[PDB]
Design an enzyme around this catalytic site. Structure first.
Site, PDB file in Angstrom:
ATOM      1  N   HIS F  61       0.955  -1.411   0.347  1.00 32.91           N
ATOM      2  CA  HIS F  61      -0.286   0.096  -0.107  1.00 32.91           C
ATOM      3  C   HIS F  61       1.297   1.440   0.458  1.00 32.91           C
ATOM      4  N   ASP F  91      10.733  22.041 -25.694  1.00 34.46           N
ATOM      5  CA  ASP F  91      10.598  20.224 -25.112  1.00 34.46           C
ATOM      6  C   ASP F  91      11.626  20.474 -23.652  1.00 34.46           C
ATOM      7  N   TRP F 126       7.131  -0.225   4.741  1.00 34.62           N
ATOM      8  CA  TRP F 126       7.903   0.439   3.720  1.00 34.62           C
ATOM      9  C   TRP F 126       9.106   0.521   3.850  1.00 34.62           C
ATOM     10  N   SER F 156      14.838   5.790 -12.028  1.00 34.48           N
ATOM     11  CA  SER F 156      14.157   6.480 -12.352  1.00 34.48           C
ATOM     12  C   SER F 156      13.688   7.795 -12.519  1.00 34.48           C
ATOM     13  N   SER F 157      14.022   8.365 -10.658  1.00 37.17           N
ATOM     14  CA  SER F 157      13.413   9.696 -10.742  1.00 37.17           C
ATOM     15  C   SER F 157      15.142  10.499 -10.951  1.00 37.17           C
ATOM     16  N   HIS F 240      12.826  11.425   5.205  1.00 39.93           N
ATOM     17  CA  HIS F 240      12.808  12.838   5.106  1.00 39.93           C
ATOM     18  C   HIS F 240      13.094  12.954   3.680  1.00 39.93           C
ATOM     19  N   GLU F 242      12.442  12.354   0.985  1.00 37.31           N
ATOM     20  CA  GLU F 242      10.999  12.071   0.486  1.00 37.31           C
ATOM     21  C   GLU F 242       9.914  12.397   0.647  1.00 37.31           C
ATOM     22  N   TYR F 244       9.390  15.703   1.846  1.00 35.80           N
ATOM     23  CA  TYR F 244       9.342  17.199   1.664  1.00 35.80           C
ATOM     24  C   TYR F 244       9.184  16.873  -0.749  1.00 35.80           C
ATOM     25  N   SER F 255      -0.239  27.388  -4.792  1.00 34.12           N
ATOM     26  CA  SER F 255       0.097  28.353  -5.623  1.00 34.12           C
ATOM     27  C   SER F 255      -0.834  28.527  -6.537  1.00 34.12           C
ATOM     28  N   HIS F 290      14.491  12.359  13.847  1.00 35.79           N
ATOM     29  CA  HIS F 290      12.970  12.382  14.269  1.00 35.79           C
ATOM     30  C   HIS F 290      12.259  11.342  13.977  1.00 35.79           C
ATOM     31  N   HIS F 291      12.725  10.330  13.218  1.00 36.73           N
ATOM     32  CA  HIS F 291      12.183   8.928  12.730  1.00 36.73           C
ATOM     33  C   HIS F 291      12.769   7.707  13.598  1.00 36.73           C
ATOM     34  N   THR F 316       7.053  26.970   6.379  1.00 35.17           N
ATOM     35  CA  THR F 316       6.483  26.791   6.208  1.00 35.17           C
ATOM     36  C   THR F 316       4.614  27.082   6.554  1.00 35.17           C
ATOM     37  N   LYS F 319       4.081  30.254   4.069  1.00 31.33           N
ATOM     38  CA  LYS F 319       3.033  28.999   2.799  1.00 31.33           C
ATOM     39  C   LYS F 319       1.806  29.002   3.007  1.00 31.33           C
ATOM     40  N   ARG F 438       1.467   0.282  15.216  1.00 32.68           N
ATOM     41  CA  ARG F 438       1.384   0.665  14.403  1.00 32.68           C
ATOM     42  C   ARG F 438       1.418  -0.864  13.808  1.00 32.68           C
TER      43      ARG F 438
HETATM   44  C1  HEA Z   1       4.012  14.724   2.929  1.00 31.11           C
HETATM   45  C2  HEA Z   1       4.085  13.879   4.196  1.00 31.11           C
HETATM   46  C3  HEA Z   1       4.333  14.783   4.551  1.00 31.11           C
HETATM   47  C4  HEA Z   1       4.926  15.714   5.346  1.00 31.11           C
HETATM   48  C5  HEA Z   1       5.028  17.064   4.410  1.00 31.11           C
HETATM   49  C6  HEA Z   1       5.531  15.952   6.693  1.00 31.11           C
HETATM   50  C7  HEA Z   1       5.496  17.087   7.269  1.00 31.11           C
HETATM   51  C8  HEA Z   1       5.876  16.727   8.761  1.00 31.11           C
HETATM   52  N1  HEA Z   1       5.931  15.803   9.577  1.00 31.11           N
HETATM   53 FE1  HEA Z   1       5.910  13.785   9.058  1.00 31.11          FE
HETATM   54  N2  HEA Z   1       5.688  11.660   8.180  1.00 31.11           N
HETATM   55  C9  HEA Z   1       4.882  11.382   7.091  1.00 31.11           C
HETATM   56  C10 HEA Z   1       4.493  12.458   5.937  1.00 31.11           C
HETATM   57  C11 HEA Z   1       4.967  13.729   6.370  1.00 31.11           C
HETATM   58  N3  HEA Z   1       5.180  14.461   7.127  1.00 31.11           N
HETATM   59  C12 HEA Z   1       5.350   9.888   7.089  1.00 31.11           C
HETATM   60  C13 HEA Z   1       4.762   9.412   5.608  1.00 31.11           C
HETATM   61  C14 HEA Z   1       5.882   9.410   8.434  1.00 31.11           C
HETATM   62  C15 HEA Z   1       6.040   8.172   9.025  1.00 31.11           C
HETATM   63  C16 HEA Z   1       7.134   7.751   8.598  1.00 31.11           C
HETATM   64  C17 HEA Z   1       7.186   6.348   8.552  1.00 31.11           C
HETATM   65  O1  HEA Z   1       7.495   5.521   9.806  1.00 31.11           O
HETATM   66  O2  HEA Z   1       6.613   5.537   7.794  1.00 31.11           O
HETATM   67  C18 HEA Z   1       6.118  10.662   9.010  1.00 31.11           C
HETATM   68  C19 HEA Z   1       6.568  10.806  10.240  1.00 31.11           C
HETATM   69  C20 HEA Z   1       6.729  11.554  11.243  1.00 31.11           C
HETATM   70  C21 HEA Z   1       7.774  11.772  12.300  1.00 31.11           C
HETATM   71  C22 HEA Z   1       7.779  10.414  12.855  1.00 31.11           C
HETATM   72  C23 HEA Z   1       6.877   9.971  14.515  1.00 31.11           C
HETATM   73  C24 HEA Z   1       7.275   8.626  14.443  1.00 31.11           C
HETATM   74  O3  HEA Z   1       7.848   8.035  13.869  1.00 31.11           O
HETATM   75  O4  HEA Z   1       7.763   8.589  15.998  1.00 31.11           O
HETATM   76  C25 HEA Z   1       7.556  13.119  12.184  1.00 31.11           C
HETATM   77  C26 HEA Z   1       8.601  13.350  13.992  1.00 31.11           C
HETATM   78  O5  HEA Z   1       9.116  14.294  14.102  1.00 31.11           O
HETATM   79  C27 HEA Z   1       7.664  13.962  11.906  1.00 31.11           C
HETATM   80  C28 HEA Z   1       7.255  15.430  12.121  1.00 31.11           C
HETATM   81  C29 HEA Z   1       6.547  16.326  10.670  1.00 31.11           C
HETATM   82  C30 HEA Z   1       6.612  17.633  11.334  1.00 31.11           C
HETATM   83  C31 HEA Z   1       7.256  18.745  11.641  1.00 31.11           C
HETATM   84  C32 HEA Z   1       6.275  18.379   9.182  1.00 31.11           C
HETATM   85  C33 HEA Z   1       6.316  20.007   9.025  1.00 31.11           C
HETATM   86  O6  HEA Z   1       6.525  19.854   7.809  1.00 31.11           O
HETATM   87  C34 HEA Z   1       4.622  20.061   9.039  1.00 31.11           C
HETATM   88  C35 HEA Z   1       5.273  21.807   8.767  1.00 31.11           C
HETATM   89  C36 HEA Z   1       3.836  22.132   8.826  1.00 31.11           C
HETATM   90  C37 HEA Z   1       2.941  23.341   9.874  1.00 31.11           C
HETATM   91  C38 HEA Z   1       3.082  23.322  11.104  1.00 31.11           C
HETATM   92  C39 HEA Z   1       1.326  23.604   9.608  1.00 31.11           C
HETATM   93  C40 HEA Z   1       1.582  25.098   9.251  1.00 31.11           C
HETATM   94  C41 HEA Z   1       2.322  25.946   9.809  1.00 31.11           C
HETATM   95  C42 HEA Z   1       1.372  26.925  10.627  1.00 31.11           C
HETATM   96  C43 HEA Z   1       0.426  27.209   9.883  1.00 31.11           C
HETATM   97  C44 HEA Z   1       2.675  27.963  11.207  1.00 31.11           C
HETATM   98  C45 HEA Z   1       2.028  28.559  12.901  1.00 31.11           C
HETATM   99  C46 HEA Z   1       2.448  27.444  13.072  1.00 31.11           C
HETATM  100  C47 HEA Z   1       3.590  26.448  13.952  1.00 31.11           C
HETATM  101  C48 HEA Z   1       3.413  27.646  15.387  1.00 31.11           C
HETATM  102  C49 HEA Z   1       3.938  25.586  14.874  1.00 31.11           C
HETATM  103  N4  HEA Z   1       6.669  13.123  10.847  1.00 31.11           N
HETATM  104  O1  LIG Z   2       8.628  12.187   7.583  1.00 34.00           O
HETATM  105  O2  LIG Z   2       7.731  13.403   8.421  1.00 34.00           O
HETATM  106 CU   LIG Z   3      10.876  12.975   8.721  1.00 35.09          CU
END
Ligand code: HEA
Ligand SMILES: [O-][O-]
Ligand SMILES: [Cu+2]
Ligand SMILES: CCCCC/C=C\C/C=C/C/C=C\C/C=C\CCCC(=O)O[C@H](COC(=O)CCCCCCCCCCCCCCCCC)COP(=O)(O)OCCN
Ligand SMILES: CCCCC/C=C/C/C=C/CCCCCCCC(=O)O[C@H](COC(=O)CCCCCCCCCCCCCCC)COP(=O)(O)OCC[N+](C)(C)C
Ligand SMILES: CCCCCC/C=C/CCCCCCCCCC(=O)O[C@H](COC(=O)CCCCCCCCCCCCCCC)COP(=O)(O)OC[C@@H](O)CO
Ligand SMILES: CCCCCCCCCCO[C@@H]1O[C@H](CO)[C@@H](O[C@H]2O[C@H](CO)[C@@H](O)[C@H](O)[C@H]2O)[C@H](O)[C@H]1O
Ligand code: CUA
Ligand SMILES: [Mg+2]
Ligand code: NA
Ligand code: NA
Ligand SMILES: [Zn+2]
Lengths: 43, 73, 98, 58, 144, 514, 105, 49, 259, 84, 46, 79, 227
Positions: F61, F91, F126, F156-157, F240, F242, F244, F255, F290-291, F316, F319, F438
């Site tokens: 999945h 192109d 995964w 590919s990527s 991580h 990935e 982003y 946007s 942080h993972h 963030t 934006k 999980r």
């Molecule tokens: C598109 C995918 C995506 C994105 C963009 C993010 C974005 C972020 N993620 Fe996430 N995350 C995942 C996909 C994603 N994550 C996945 C797949 C996992 C698990 C992987 C696995 O184990 O399989 C995961 C796991 C994961 C963990 C591990 C937790 C654990 O396994 O125990 C953590 C820990 O810090 C984390 C943190 C964050 C943070 C801080 C952001 C930041 O980028 C977010 C920032 C955004 C904001 C904060 C919102 C907008 C901001 C405002 C409106 C301003 C004011 C806000 C404040 C003042 C706070 N993520």
């Molecule tokens: O990886 O959040």
């Molecule tokens: Cu991460």
């Protein structure tokens, strides 16, 4: 956006057909498998 | 009849923005007050009141007599 | 210490590479390698826009350092104006590469 | 060695509508056919091997 | 009147309330009487009739502001159809419970749950807020 | 001709079309796997089997949704279609290498399907952590077929990234600086840099796993002096960035959509948006552990990874507020694409905020490997990356095809999906906080009510996915041909008509320097 | 930057230019309505008289519609502007959108 | 002229709403789903030992 | 007719055949590892070489023979090659991270020390130092080749490029001998794992770079390069300096500091 | 640093050829001397069946499954010791 | 050259909407069905 | 000679979550001490503290494997 | 253990878990407030016919929406990091207990004084005694003395596992070849449950943890009886 009227209009009846066929194409094979899970497992 | 008075004609959108952002700010303070009283402090007082006269040996003896323990009958 | 035997571009460049080389020597830019410099852009002094057909897309950066570019088709005929800043553009169609 | 690049430039600029990968002549077509046959043949065989490895052999 | 695909690079008409004067007239070809109307527009507009003024407007523009800004009943269709397909989804869930799911474990039988509840209370599960805190050990009943 | 055109393509639009078709098919595959997950969990007990078959399904999945659906659609699909049009290029820099980036993906997907068909599949997560993924606890070919699947997707990527960076740097009009390129173009270029730097590190780590499995190396095996935690570092060093990579092209499409349907000529605070995307891309490389907050790392290290992860909220937030400021004063058009983008802004913000909760290592002790994490990342992926995809697809479908969707059906589609994804994932926060782990095929009885609601939500999303297929069919079946598009002066990709000719910008745009 | 009075005067001057052409009329109105304001009667007056010099009755009516539209929910602004323009409307023979039935959905 | 929504809007809304409520209430109460609600205020605890 | 300077490439089969060759090599490795068979693998390696051969042949036809490589196209190939090398640096970086991770914190199974108990490292002053002088020297000869080409000197280009290639071959033969003579193996814990995988991928890159230099050598013999336009040679030289710099990092990290 | 040479009048083929023959290759020739000199076999150490060495979690996909790819009988013992 | 225009810039035909429906049904239906059949294949081994 | 041993106290050499080297070092220290005492005409009871610490901290299977390897001649640490 | 329809954390059994509760309340209020503010501002932007579509100056407002988030982040990080280092502090345990993870069960070793060790396996659903909890009970519980500081040492003899007890705030990964340390102190007697928290194969869902917290004298006699 602006667009022309449809060149080959799809009436409500045609839409009900495309909608039904589309759903059946997802629902029937998966339904078949899930229905027969027991047979697969306690095979 | 009578002429119509000249109304405000400029900065209408900016005026609406200013007024509602300040309203959002005053609601945000009101909510934090509610939250700090309904959730955070409530939790602090439930824990403090629970442990103030807590008797852990008496707690244990109740559990023991109810039969829950492997090590203690 | 040093004979020859390596061809030069002048001897051996071919195709479009050679067309670009030879046109550059004439001061010409038929393949649009350089940015054109603006005129004052009035109706009397319009930006002259070469083309091999009867219309070309113009992008207008109305003011220096604008990040927004204003795009529009410029057609053969009377000068047209940028819908944002009004500066004048006129198409000058022609014959075989620019 | 002599510089024969001009002859190759004439050959590959000939206005015969051929794509670049076939423009050298009939040997291009043979090499193309050998390559694509091995790729397509080998891909079918990989599918056969997947199908074989998909089931236990007691 | 008639807009063609092959015209995409030409200035075009739009009705947008933030673009009140579009780049072209809605109608460019004029009948004999519409030509005469355009000549009469060059004299005093007080001599134009109401009908002539409406016609001059309709030559220049397709829809008026009131027409182009009008609201619709589309929300009814959208919300009603969404609720239909959400309702359809429950049929899938009915089918799944009937033909796919077997019995759930015996630990959900009423008597098991009553005894497990007593046992959770005897071990004082979550005694500060979450579970046993809601039981009155003195009156032997759930707190009001 | 058909083979020449569709198997031998050197055309950025046709290759973009191939990527959209491929991602759509993968999305059906990922959706079915998501429903099998939720059928297993939809009532207490065991439906399919023990955790092995269950986690084969979970693993597939994730791989399918990430590598075969989101990345090919955002980057291969929208990036190939839109990036050259948006800069007036004829192109991509490497149009023939571009085609190999596409044609490596069906082989990659075949290797992943093969892995699930042989032996008992790769039931690894995964993340593919050893020793579970090594040759004793996962003997046989499945894990190696998974690793090879990743190698092909990674090639590919990487080649795609090279192609996109080169095109965006080298093929703009000579008067256009990087600070006159649209935000979507910026988001693709930054995404491509992230791909370039991160995937080779993934490739090194999974290669070391391959050799531990087949050549008797012991990179990750303590009996040879190796370390299971080393694999986790190498993987998350990629993993991580990935995520982003998964969201940045979404940010760029958002946007453009929000600007377009506000009737604006430009997004609010353009340079701030560029700054924010670069800042996110940079900070995305220094936060990977942080993972790993429960693996046993020193406390100062945990304190560093806590604080560096939290700072990403600042760019963030710029934006999010700049999107809100783009709406401000707009002539709002309530199109289906605008609804996807509005849902995005709010629901990505929720999931970003639960990411910030998770950045606190202290609290993450208790939340890690629980459904609170699953809730976080589906808010940003099912209601974030996917919402930007759906918004982008509805908005540009008329450009790519020449035909209009029925807008009423597309609004119906949005509403159903919006109900389904929130019903699916919102209760998983509660399951997380209360301790449900999980990768469980079954749960203690107390977790029954939220799992039941969550599975009902997944069935509502299923109905939206089926309806989507019908809506695309109705568009092609009725053939309503586009006539006029508004705001072409600030949306160059529309300026060659719908669909644009096979060759565009054969004569380049004219742009002077002044 | 400039006072409200300097803004309005720049706009009155723009539309009063005797030989303003049709493109400049459209460009002025289409730019003007981007601002966070309903244009002062004296601006609309000058734009209407430009319409007259351009023999364009229909754009005069459209300009009145856009005054109404720019006011949004503030239903008092448009009847005030029309009140102030009435001598010009009479002098030029310009019927309002309401007098033409063009406020009907 | 009245479009599809003028003609059929009220009926789609009314029928969609009524069908949706009826079938979810049915699914939720009539087919043996175990919601497993809280015992608090609901279950009489029974001797287990 | 176009009036930009960029290359519209003829529709080509080689992306497809390269992608299928990747399927055949990876499913071939699976069959070799798990089903005791080399057939798929050899087919994939054959189609992969065929693909590379025809693809780069066509690039030569398009540039030297058809003239499509204008300056703008060359600039793009420059970026492409730089970015490709950056990706290869990050690939090796993961293997150096593995090496430092294991050697800086040697586990109890190793004796708690590095080099592990029972490992007898090569002397870095013998063949490893020789390898170092060889690759460094080839960096000097390829630079002489470059300057000869820019100055229009066909004979000295060929001579310097031939010296460069001979050195690359020498390195490869020395490394193959060291592999055979080494008393530790890839199965000798994390020492052998990091040693042979990291130097093994490096040696693969030496062979790829040497092959690339040999291609430039025959293209030079056929007068393809001009004194001003020779990007294939520049790319091969950049790739060669990358292979050199990776060696130096291997030498200092694994052979010398890790001994 | 500046090494200790000089020149820098310009950069040319002649200078890089000077460097190739006057510094680079003589360096190679000297290390070639040094190495093929300290060559010759050394006494292979006593065999100890260390559990962190001679790892076998899966048979090698060639030969008898127990020999490494560039197995040298003289210096590479098997898990059970040197070959005979 | 190639055909240009709506319905012509795509590898599948939209000339007949019912043949299109059948092609799209097989295309998306095969993607959705595949994991169910792989689950079945795995259960039917052991 | 300081007893009432309960469990191994905090050791500033090993202040972090990963305690592997604490177990390892005390295992080595005990067997080094025992070898010194067994030979030089002394008594292992001076080694007792290390033995208590490593017994407290070390998984049974680690000790048992390390003991087996010392017996076999394959223990990679220096004792 | 968790109870039906539970929304939040399990009640705290240790002071550290109590600290995490208050820190989560503090962080959740900020999450609600920011989420609500975004939702409200969105609705504000969308509810007026007034327009303003000319170019907007940004640099003024971007100060606000960089500075206020930075402050908010500091207001989270401060209590976050205080708890982090508070958790790390030296404590002088009275007792060390090891747990080894296995496919699929836990073993425990109490070897401060005697060689006491045993296996702990899930009670199968068919063998639960009435009142007992499905997937959560074990045959041999981890008996421990209450109100005392305990060092838990965690490893594995096969794949990764993770040893967790939510109401004590505990989760420590079980990694072969590695000995991870955590500290545990229960304020109350009772039974406290957790579950394997790293994917580990076929029975990952079915290898739970049960701590039995009792007074020291009962623990001592239990320990003697388990030799
Ligand atoms: C598109 C995918 C995506 C994105 C963009 C993010 C974005 C972020 N993620 Fe996430 N995350 C995942 C996909 C994603 N994550 C996945 C797949 C996992 C698990 C992987 C696995 O184990 O399989 C995961 C796991 C994961 C963990 C591990 C937790 C654990 O396994 O125990 C953590 C820990 O810090 C984390 C943190 C964050 C943070 C801080 C952001 C930041 O980028 C977010 C920032 C955004 C904001 C904060 C919102 C907008 C901001 C405002 C409106 C301003 C004011 C806000 C404040 C003042 C706070 N993520
Ligand atoms: O990886 O959040
Ligand atoms: Cu991460
Ligand atoms: C002559 C100097 C250079 C020698 C080169 C010889 C062949 C190596 C080819 C290069 C591949 C490099 C890495 C492959 C992994 C291991 C090879 C390490 C180098 C090597 O050749 O190691 C040899 C072992 O080879 C073995 O296992 C057998 C290895 C054979 C199979 C290779 C396995 C598959 C490789 C996977 C490739 C993935 C590629 C990355 C894709 C990235 C996509 C983004 C060492 O021999 P030994 O007997 O143990 O000890 C010597 C004792 N006297
Ligand atoms: C985590 C917590 C985060 C909390 C975040 C809270 C955000 C609070 C936001 C408050 C914003 C206050 C901004 C004030 C900017 C003032 C700029 C200005 O002063 O206005 C103008 C500059 O305009 C211009 O750039 C264009 C005008 C607007 C420029 C600024 C627009 C900003 C809009 C933001 C909308 C809300 C979006 C963010 C909400 C978070 C100048 O206008 P004039 O009348 O002279 O021209 C009109 C011509 N006349 C009058 C002469 C006729
Ligand atoms: C044991 C081996 C197993 C694996 C097989 C590897 C095989 C070895 C292949 C070695 C690489 C050979 C590359 C030959 C390239 C020839 C084409 C070429 O060099 O083409 C040049 C363009 O550069 C271009 O495309 C340059 C593009 C070339 C990039 C090549 C970089 C190497 C990539 C190899 C793959 C590495 C994989 C590593 C493992 C992860 C043509 O432009 P010019 O030279 O300016 O000529 C024009 C003038 O004539 C006009 O006057
Ligand atoms: C997660 C995605 C799936 C969502 C749920 C799917 C909804 C089910 C759609 C219907 O599927 C069909 O269901 C029939 C039962 O209603 C099955 O017939 C089965 O049952 C019939 C009645 O017992 C017999 O007549 C048939 O022979 C026997 O195949 C049939 O095979 C299956 O295709
Ligand atoms: Cu043990 Cu999961
Ligand atoms: Mg974990
Ligand atoms: Na289940
Ligand atoms: Na050069
Ligand atoms: Zn302009």
């Amino acid at each position: 956006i602006t667009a022309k009227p449809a060149k080959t209009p799809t009436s409500p009846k045609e839409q009900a057909i495309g909608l039904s066929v589309t759903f059946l194409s997802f629902l029937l094979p998966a339904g078949w498998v899930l229905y027969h899970l027991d047979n697969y497992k306690k095979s | 009849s009578t002429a119509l008075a000249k109304p405000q004609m400029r900065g209408l959108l900016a005026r609406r923005l200013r007024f509602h952002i300040v309203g959002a700010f005053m609601v945000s303070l009101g909510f934090a007050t509610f939250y700090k009283f309904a959730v955070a402090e409530k939790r602090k007082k439930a824990y403090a009141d629970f442990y103030r006269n807590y008797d852990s040996m008496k707690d244990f003896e109740e559990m023991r007599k109810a039969g829950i323990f492997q090590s203690a009958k | 210490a040093s004979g020859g035997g390596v061809p030069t571009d002048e001897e051996q460049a071919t195709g479009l590479e050679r067309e670009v080389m030879l046109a550059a020597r004439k001061g010409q830019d038929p393949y649009n390698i350089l940015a054109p410099k603006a005129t004052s852009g009035t109706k009397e002094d319009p930006n002259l826009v070469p083309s091999i057909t009867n219309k070309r897309i113009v992008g207008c950066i109305c003011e220096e350092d604008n990040s927004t570019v204003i795009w529009f088709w410029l057609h053969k005929g009377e000068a047209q104006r940028c819908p944002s800043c009004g500066t004048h553009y006129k198409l000058v169609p022609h014959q075989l590469a620019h | 060695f002599e510089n024969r690049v001009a002859e190759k430039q004439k050959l590959f600029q000939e206005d015969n509508g051929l794509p670049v990968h076939l423009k050298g002549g009939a040997t291009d077509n043979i090499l193309y056919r050998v390559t694509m046959t091995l790729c397509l043949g080998g891909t079918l065989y990989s599918l056969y091997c997947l199908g074989w490895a998909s089931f236990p052999h007691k | 009147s008639v807009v063609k695909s092959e015209d995409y690079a030409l200035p075009s008409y739009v009705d947008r309330r933030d673009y009140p004067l579009p780049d072209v007239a809605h109608v460019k070809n004029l009948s004999a009487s519409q030509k005469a109307l355009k000549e009469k527009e060059k004299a005093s507009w007080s001599s134009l009739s109401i009908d002539e003024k409406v016609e001059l407007y309709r030559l220049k523009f397709k829809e008026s502001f009131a027409e182009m800004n009008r609201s619709t009943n589309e929300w009814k269709t959208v919300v009603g159809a969404a609720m239909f397909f959400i309702g359809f989804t429950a049929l899938l869930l009915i089918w799944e419970k009937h033909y796919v799911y077997g019995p759930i474990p015996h630990t959900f039988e009423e008597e098991w749950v009553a005894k497990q509840t007593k046992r959770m209370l005897d071990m004082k599960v979550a005694p500060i807020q979450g579970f046993s805190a809601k039981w009155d050990y003195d009156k032997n009943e759930w707190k009001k | 001709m058909f083979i020449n055109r569709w198997l031998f393509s050197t055309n950025h639009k046709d290759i973009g079309t191939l990527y959209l078709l491929f991602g759509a098919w993968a999305g059906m595959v990922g959706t079915a796997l998501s429903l099998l997950i939720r059928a297993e969990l939809g009532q207490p007990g065991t439906l399919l089997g023990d955790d092995q078959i269950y986690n084969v399904v979970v693993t597939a999945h994730a791989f399918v949704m990430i590598f075969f659906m989101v990345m090919p659609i955002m980057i291969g699909g929208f990036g190939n279609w839109l990036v050259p049009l948006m800069i007036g290029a004829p192109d991509m820099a490497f149009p023939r290498m571009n085609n190999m980036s596409f044609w490596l993906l069906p082989p990659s997907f075949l290797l992943l399907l093969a892995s699930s068909m042989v032996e008992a599949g790769a039931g690894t997560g995964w993340t593919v952590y050893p020793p579970l993924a090594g040759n004793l606890a996962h003997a046989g070919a499945s894990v190696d077929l998974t690793i090879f699947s990743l190698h092909l997707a990674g090639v590919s990527s990487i080649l795609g990234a090279i192609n996109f960076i080169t095109t965006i740097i080298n093929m703009k009009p000579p008067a256009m600086s990087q600070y006159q390129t649209p935000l979507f173009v910026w988001s693709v270029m930054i995404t491509a840099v992230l791909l370039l730097l991160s995937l080779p590190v993934l490739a090194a780590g999974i290669t070391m796993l391959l050799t531990d499995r087949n050549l008797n190396t012991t990179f990750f095996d303590p009996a040879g002096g190796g370390d299971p935690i080393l694999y986790q570092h190498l993987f998350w060093f990629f993993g991580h960035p990935e995520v982003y990579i998964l969201i940045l092209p979404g940010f760029g499409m958002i946007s453009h959509i929000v600007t377009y349907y506000s009737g604006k000529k430009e997004p609010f605070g353009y340079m701030g948006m560029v700054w924010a995307m670069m800042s996110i891309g940079f900070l995305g490389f220094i936060v990977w552990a942080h993972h790993m907050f429960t693996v046993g790392m020193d406390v100062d290290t945990r304190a560093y990874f806590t604080s560096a992860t939290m700072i990403i909220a600042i760019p963030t937030g710029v934006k999010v507020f700049s999107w809100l400021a783009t709406l401000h004063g707009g002539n709002i058009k309530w199109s289906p694409a605008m609804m996807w983008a509005l849902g995005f802004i709010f629901l990505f913000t929720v999931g970003g905020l639960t990411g910030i909760v998770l950045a606190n290592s202290s609290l993450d002790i208790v939340l890690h490997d629980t459904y609170y994490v699953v809730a976080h990342f589906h808010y940003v992926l099912s209601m974030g990356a996917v919402f930007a995809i759906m918004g982008g697809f509805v908005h540009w479908f008329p450009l790519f095809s020449g035909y209009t969707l029925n807008d009423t059906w597309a609004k119906i589609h949005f509403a159903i999906m919006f109900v389904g994804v929130n019903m699916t994932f919102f209760p998983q926060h509660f399951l997380g906080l209360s301790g449900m782990p999980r990768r469980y095929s079954d749960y203690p009885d107390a977790y029954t009510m939220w799992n039941t609601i969550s599975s009902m939500g997944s069935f509502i999303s299923l109905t939206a996915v089926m309806l989507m297929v019908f809506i695309i069919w109705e568009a092609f079946a009725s053939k309503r041909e586009v006539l006029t598009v508004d705001l072409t002066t600030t949306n160059l990709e529309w300026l060659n008509g719908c669909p644009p000719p096979y060759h565009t910008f054969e004569e380049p745009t004219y742009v002077n320097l002044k | 930057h400039e006072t409200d009075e300097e803004f309005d005067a720049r706009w009155v001057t723009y539309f009063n230019k005797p030989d303003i052409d049709a493109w400049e009329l459209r460009k002025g109105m289409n730019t003007l309505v981007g601002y966070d304001l309903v244009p002062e009667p004296k601006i609309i007056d000058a734009a209407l008289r430009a319409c007259r010099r351009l023999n364009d009755f229909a754009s005069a009516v459209r300009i009145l519609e856009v005054v109404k539209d720019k006011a949004g929910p503030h239903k008092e602004i448009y009847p005030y502007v029309i009140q102030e323009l009435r001598p010009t409307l009479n002098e030029l023979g310009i019927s309002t959108p309401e007098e033409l039935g063009l406020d009907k959905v | 002229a009245p479009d599809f929504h003028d003609k059929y809007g009220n009926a789609v809304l009314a029928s969609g709403a009524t069908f949706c409520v009826a079938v979810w209430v049915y699914m939720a109460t009539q087919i043996g789903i175990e919601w497993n609600p809280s015992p608090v205020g609901r279950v009489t605890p029974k001797e287990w030992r | 007719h176009q009036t930009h300077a960029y290359h519209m490439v003829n529709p080509s089969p080689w992306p497809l055949t390269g992608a299928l060759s990747a399927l055949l090599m990876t499913s071939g490795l699976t069959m070799w590892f798990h089903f005791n068979s080399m057939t798929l693998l050899m087919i994939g390696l054959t189609t992969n070489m065929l693909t590379m051969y025809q693809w780069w042949r066509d690039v030569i036809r398009e540039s030297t023979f058809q003239g499509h490589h204008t300056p703008a196209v060359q600039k793009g190939l420059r970026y492409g090659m730089i970015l490709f090398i950056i990706s290869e640096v990050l690939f090796f970086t993961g293997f150096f991270w593995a090496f430092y991770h294991s050697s800086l914190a040697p586990t109890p199974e190793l004796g708690g020390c590095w080099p592990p108990t029972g490992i007898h490292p090569l002397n870095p002053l013998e063949v490893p130092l020789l390898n170092t002088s060889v690759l460094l020297a080839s960096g000097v000869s390829i630079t002489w080749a470059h300057h000869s080409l820019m100055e229009g000197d066909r004979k000295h280009m060929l001579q310097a490029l031939f010296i460069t290639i001979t050195l690359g071959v020498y390195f490869t033969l020395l490394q193959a001998s060291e592999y055979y003579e080494a008393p530790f193996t890839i199965s000798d814990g994390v020492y052998g794992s990091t040693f042979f995988v990291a130097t093994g991928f490096h040696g693969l890159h030496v062979i790829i770079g040497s092959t690339f230099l040999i291609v430039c050598f025959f293209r030079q013999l056929k007068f393809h390069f001009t004194s001003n336009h020779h990007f294939g040679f520049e790319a091969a030289a950049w790739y060669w300096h990358f292979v050199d710099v990776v060696w130096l990092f291997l030498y200092v990290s694994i052979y010398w500091w890790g001994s | 640093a500046s090494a200790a040479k000089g020149d820098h009048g310009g950069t040319g083929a002649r200078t890089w050829r000077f460097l190739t023959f006057g510094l680079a290759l003589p360096s190679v020739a000297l290390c070639t001397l040094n190495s093929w000199l300290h060559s010759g076999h050394r006494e292979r150490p006593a065999f100890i069946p260390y559990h962190h060495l001679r790892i076998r979690t899966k048979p090698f996909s060639w030969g008898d499954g127990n020999h490494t790819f560039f197995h040298n009988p003289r210096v590479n013992p098997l898990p059970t010791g040197y070959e005979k | 050259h190639y055909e240009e225009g709506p319905g012509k810039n795509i590898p599948f035909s939209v000339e007949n909407k019912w043949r299109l429906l059948a092609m799209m049904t097989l295309f998306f239906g095969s993607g959705f069905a595949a994991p169910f059949f792989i689950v079945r294949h795995q259960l039917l081994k052991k | 000679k300081i007893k009432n041993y309960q469990t191994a106290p905090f050791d500033s050499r090993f202040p972090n979550q990963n305690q592997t080297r604490n177990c390892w070092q005390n295992y080595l220290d005990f067997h080094r001490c025992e070898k010194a005492m067994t030979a030089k005409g002394g008594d292992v009871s001076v080694c007792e503290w290390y033995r208590r610490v490593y017994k407290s901290l070390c998984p049974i299977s680690w000790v048992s494997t390390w003991d087996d390897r010392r017996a076999e001649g394959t223990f990679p640490g220096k004792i | 253990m968790a109870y039906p329809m539970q929304l939040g954390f399990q009640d705290a059994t240790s002071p550290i878990m109590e600290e995490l509760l208050h820190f989560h309340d503090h962080t959740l209020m900020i999450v609600f407030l920011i989420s609500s503010l975004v939702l409200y501002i969105i609705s504000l932007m969308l509810t007026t016919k007034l327009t303003h579509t000319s170019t907007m100056d940004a640099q003024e407002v971007e100060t606000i929406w960089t500075i206020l988030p930075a402050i908010i982040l500091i207001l989270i990080a401060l209590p976050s990091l205080r708890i982090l280092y508070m958790m790390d502090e030296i404590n002088n345990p009275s007792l060390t207990v090891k747990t080894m993870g296995h496919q699929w069960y836990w073993s425990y070793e109490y070897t401060d004084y005697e060689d006491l060790s045993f296996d702990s396996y899930m009670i199968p659903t068919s063998e639960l005694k009435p009142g007992e909890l499905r997937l959560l009970e074990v045959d041999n519980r981890v008996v421990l003395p209450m109100e005392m500081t305990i060092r838990m040492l965690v490893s594995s003899e096969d794949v990764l596992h993770s040893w967790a007890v939510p109401s004590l705030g505990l989760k420590t990964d079980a990694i072969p070849g590695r000995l991870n340390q955590t500290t545990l102190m229960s304020s109350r007697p009772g039974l406290y449950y957790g579950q394997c928290s790293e994917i580990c194969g076929s029975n990952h869902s079915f290898m739970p943890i049960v701590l039995e917290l009792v007074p020291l004298k009962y623990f001592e006699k239990w320990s003697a009886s388990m030799l």
